[PDB]
Amino acid sequence: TGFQICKNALKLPVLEVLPGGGWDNLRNVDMGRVMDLT
Amino acid sequence: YTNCKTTEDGQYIIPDEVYTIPQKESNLEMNSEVLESWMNYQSTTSLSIN
C-alpha cells in the first residue's frame, strides 16, 4: 500500500494532508489511520 | 526499512513502523530594546573686583 510506484511513474509529490486518520478530540491530536489508503 | 516508506512530501525515508503527521509550523519572536540617557551639565561663575 505504498505510493512509491506512482511517484516513480508520475514524478509528483503526494498530498501530505489526508483524511481517514483517527483524531483524539480530548488532546486534539492525530492518531493512526482508520480507513485504508491504497 | 523493508517497504522503503517515505513521508508524503518526499523529503525523508522513514521506517515501516512509524507514520508522520506534517505540521510545518514556525514561530519567530524578536524583541529589541534600546535605552539611551544623556545628561549634560555646564557651569561658569566669574567674579571681578576692582
Side-chain angles (χ1 to χ4, degrees), chain A residues 3-4 7 12-18 29-33, chain B residues 3-11 19-24:
Chain A
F3 49 79
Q4 190 52 231
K7 274 190 170 179
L12 293 181
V14 177
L15 190 51
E16 53 183 5
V17 31
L18 296 170
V29 76
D30 285 313
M31 341 282 300
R33 63 182 69 272
Chain B
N3 302 327
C4 288
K5 190 175 173 57
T6 308
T7 58
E8 283 76 15
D9 55 353
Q11 275 318 106
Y19 64 97
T20 71
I21 296 101
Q23 339 176 8
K24 301 173 178 178

